[PDB]
A paper describes a structure:
Bp109-92 displayed a strong antagonistic effect against TNFα-dependent activity without any functional agonistic activity. In contrast, antagonist Bp109-92 formed a homogeneous 1:1 complex of 190 kDa in the presence of excess sTNFR2; thus, 1:1 complex formation was much more advantageous than 1:2 complex formation. After several rounds of optimization, the three-dimensional structure of the Bp109-92–TNFR2 1:1 complex was determined at a resolution of 3.63 Å by cryo-EM single-particle image analysis using TNFR2-MBP. In the complex structure, Fabs from both TR92 and TR109 (92-Fab and 109-Fab) were in a parallel arrangement, as observed by negative-stain EM, and biparatopic binding involving the simultaneous binding of both variable regions was observed. The overlap of the Bp109-92 and TNFα-binding sites of TNFR2 indicated the mechanism of antagonistic activity directly derived from ligand blocking. As for the antigen, TNFR2 possesses 4 CRDs as structural units in the extracellular region. The atomic model of TNFR2 was only partially built, ranging from cysteine-rich domain 1 (CRD1) to the middle of CRD3, corresponding to the C3A region in Fig. S2, although the density corresponding to CRD3 and CRD4 was weak. CRD3 and CRD4 were oriented differently from the crystal structure of TNFR2 in the complex with TNFα. The overall structures of 109-Fab and 92-Fab were similar (r.m.s.d. = 1.20 Å among 397 Cα atoms), but the complementarity-determining region (CDR) regions were significantly changed to interact with different regions of TNFR2. In contrast, this loop partly protruded into a unique cleft between heavy chain CDR 1 (CDR-H1) and CDR-H3 of 92-Fab in the Bp109-92 complex and pulled in the opposite direction. For Bp109-92 bound to TNFR2, contact between 109-Fab and 92-Fab was observed. This contact surface was formed by the heavy chain variable domain (VH) of 92-Fab entering the concave surface at the elbow region of 109-Fab and interacting with the linker between the variable and constant regions of the light chain.
Numbering used by the authors:
A (entry chain D): 1 to 221
B (entry chain A): 8 to 119
C (entry chain E): 2 to 212
D (entry chain B): 1 to 217
E (entry chain C): 1 to 216
């Protein structure tokens, strides 16, 4: 029932300060402790101190003493984590989580933010449509996709049919092209019979650049 | 006894003013709630409350409170819920608590 | 204090039993929690107190062990057991996790389906084309894709991206994203991507022309 | 346990007889007094008569000759009869109990008496289905519009009460023709738009109808 | 009989801040010992529940953040922390002389940080089209504060005097409003026009956002 909500996505530069917001919903805030953890690319999770707001009990892990600062205002039930000296090693998912009993087992896992640190700038994605295998009808499962191309910020969301169709959808991890901008090749294998008599629109929601795309895909002759 | 009050003088302690019989009536012991309220002739007729229900103050309410359901696992009761007290859950045996709450805190710690 | 696992790549199948271990650095008594971390989503809670099954999770995720050696296990491993399980303690101020012991299911051979299709016209107008060739439901992961333009080899002109184990049937999916300059695409006539796989008796070449 | 159920006619013509019944359970009326409270829409409560256990009753100052509060102790009921209903006596009527020396503790849900002359009309329900415009971010929205009904009190539920979070019922507005209308703003997660079939239902007790509809994106 | 005047009559206090009410009485309502007053609270729609039932005596099973005080004339009900769901109307009743008279009561609101609306456009349903009427719903969501100007554009012609609005109350869990503007038209006048749209003017989103659905 308890839900923890973070922001969408951000991007900063070496020597910046982004403020991660964790908003709790479902219980009170005078009694809601908050812990912060960092999941890097590939390795295991870490842990950071807690910010019990009711008694304002603040604790910090030894490793992360001088990187994160915790503060909250008891007017919106939100906890803010201010990050300092963001080098290139801080590009990682950030989770805010809380427990229920007085032992500390993370049962309420907030959605992770996808903070990335780089000196470059954001760039909107290109959502070039892909042609279904109309010629290859013998297979009966002609696949169609949306070649997301040349978007710099790693966080990217390719929703298919606005979430209506998620069966067989593939969302290949992005590659590192020579130009330095990531690109993916999301594609779904729709039935051949329903290919021509149904819309298969795709939606790229690139939050860091505020770009939202509603590109349409249809067979051509 | 239904002590008859006189305006200009208040009821003595342990006596309330019933507003149905318009006459002062007694207040009975903690842990028992008035089953039949005071009347013109009859005094307070109060019966002990049921299990897990308490009353820590001299009352006339027709229903007691309720303690906590359980201390779950690894939490020993530091005070059983009798008729005049609560069910205060606490930390695990062999450990301590560093945080705090209204009755049972939110973060334990090993006994170091 | 540091909490470290032992192996990183438990490999198993359907019906076998896995024994993901976890060994603390001190006498951590009976404090440990197990998390399942299906990539993309957020960690879930499996076990706490080394033997207490959290509400909701299936009965097969039974914890065991005591003292300093803890062991999750699954006696009826299904398809949706593919994640990075972690173990945690509840004593020191610096809570520490370990590495990610990732399960991986092995199965029989699979026949890759090869799909090829030309780029879009507006993409050509943009300046750079793409002739992406995709392989669907291929297993073993060892499969080679090669590009022939007018029966001529290409090297360093395509990048490959592959998914993890499929959460439904432990299959795969691969994509190649051959890109050419504005003028190079119109310098040739017939394109083709060919696939060499263990599960295929003979290589299959999917080609297309300007039509 | 203690439970007080309040029942009364939804709509009564002006200058017609009015009768409410409050059924009590969990306590004995021989010692406990039940009193009524009234509340015009969007206004503060105005007190009404009380009846003690013995039978003696006190009343209001401006309605002393309009209320006839009586009791059926054996049947465990408190029924109020009122006459000469002017058009301004449209309100909710809460039953209650003075279980704590007249400090009112337990109340029953009111019936929302309405005084008018218009005939009772059933509601028309339209499934206000979503579309690509409604779908924004990771949350969609579904509607179940109700129109052209009278009197005011109408009950709306979603998924037979299963769907609770993210549900609103906009207050009824007075249509210039002389009827009422409202809609719903149910917002379900977008990740399960295809599945989780959603059914709204509305009932109008004065018109005696229970109409269901299903919303498919 | 006794007359009670409540000050204030509507107040808004943010979460975690103090609130104070005063139900002034025309006559000394202190009969014996402590004053005889009640401080009922009625949530939106819900029946009123009791709190502070004799001057300062607290009901059995009520959060301790409430309190009572005052005698004779002056009276005070204090909610030192105000949670999200402490939105209701707080009343006052005296229990001395027949009859017992209530008061106007207060309306404790929540002032949260400025939110961002999200205009959702919902078209008429085919059943209503075959019934001879058209109704389009430009419903907002999660907006705060109440001030939100909604206008309709029919082929860039702003309709006026042909729409209605309904606003809910603050949500108990998070103090959230909701608005549902309805545009009504006859079937004869529905077929003479084309694509519809809406706008918002709340002090949230920077510019008037328009969600437009094509006709047919």
């Amino acid at each position: 029932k308890v839900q923890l909500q973070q922001s969408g996505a951000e991007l900063v530069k070496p020597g910046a300060s982004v403020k991660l917001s964790c908003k709790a919903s479902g219980y009170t805030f005078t009694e809601s402790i908050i812990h912060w953890v960092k999941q890097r690319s590939g390795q295991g999770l870490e842990w950071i101190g807690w910010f019990y707001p009711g008694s304002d009990n603040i604790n910090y892990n030894e490793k992360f003493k001088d990187k994160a600062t915790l503060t909250a205002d008891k007017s919106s039930s939100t906890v803010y984590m201010e990050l300092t000296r963001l080098t290139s090693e801080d590009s990682a998912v950030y989770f805010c989580a809380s427990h229920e009993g007085p032992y500390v087992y993370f049962d309420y896992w907030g959605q992770g933010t996808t903070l990335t640190v780089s000196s470059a700038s954001t760039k909107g994605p290109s959502v070039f449509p892909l042609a279904p295998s109309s010629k290859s009808t013998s297979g009966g499962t002609a696949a169609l996709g949306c070649l997301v191309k040349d978007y710099f910020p790693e966080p990217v969301t390719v929703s298919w049919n606005s979430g209506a169709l998620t069966s067989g959808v593939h969302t290949f991890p992005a590659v590192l092209q020579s130009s330095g901008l990531y690109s993916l090749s999301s594609v779904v294998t729709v039935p051949s019979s329903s290919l021509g008599t149904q819309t298969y629109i795709c939606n790229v929601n690139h939050k860091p650049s505020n770009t939202k795309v509603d590109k349409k895909v249809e067979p051509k002759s | 006894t239904p002590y008859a009050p006189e305006p200009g003088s208040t009821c003595r302690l342990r006596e309330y003013y019933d507003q149905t019989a318009q006459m002062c009536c007694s207040k009975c012991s903690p842990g028992q709630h008035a089953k039949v309220f005071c009347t013109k002739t009859s005094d307070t007729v109060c019966d002990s409350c049921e299990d897990s229900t308490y009353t820590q103050l001299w009352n006339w309410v027709p229903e007691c409170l309720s303690c906590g359901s359980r201390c779950s696992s690894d939490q020993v009761e530091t005070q059983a819920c009798t008729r005049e007290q609560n069910r205060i859950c606490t930390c695990r045996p062999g450990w301590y608590c560093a945080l705090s709450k209204q009755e049972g805190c939110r973060l334990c710690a090993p006994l170091r | 204090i540091v909490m470290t696992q032992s192996h990183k790549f438990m490999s198993t199948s359907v019906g076998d039993r896995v024994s993901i271990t976890c060994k603390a650095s001190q006498d951590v008594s009976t404090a440990v929690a197990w998390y399942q971390q299906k990539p993309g989503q957020s960690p879930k809670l499996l076990i706490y107190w080394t033997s207490t099954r959290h509400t909701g999770v299936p009965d097969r995720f039974t914890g065991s062990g005591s003292g300093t050696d803890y062991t999750l296990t699954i006696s009826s491993v299904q398809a949706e057991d593919l994640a990075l399980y972690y173990c945690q303690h509840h004593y020191s101020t610096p809570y520490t996790f370990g590495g990610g012991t990732k399960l991986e299911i092995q199965r029989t051979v699979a026949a890759p389906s090869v799909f090829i299709f030309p780029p879009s016209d507006e993409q050509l107008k943009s300046g750079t084309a793409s002739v992406v060739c995709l392989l669907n439901n291929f297993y073993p992961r060892e499969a080679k894709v090669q590009w022939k333009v007018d029966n001529a080899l290409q090297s360093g002109n395509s990048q490959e991206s592959v998914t993890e184990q499929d959460s439904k049937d432990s299959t795969y999916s691969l994509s190649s994203t051959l890109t050419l300059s504005k003028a190079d695409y119109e310098k040739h006539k017939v394109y083709a991507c060919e696939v060499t796989h263990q599960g295929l008796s003979s290589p299959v070449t999917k080609s297309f022309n300007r039509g």
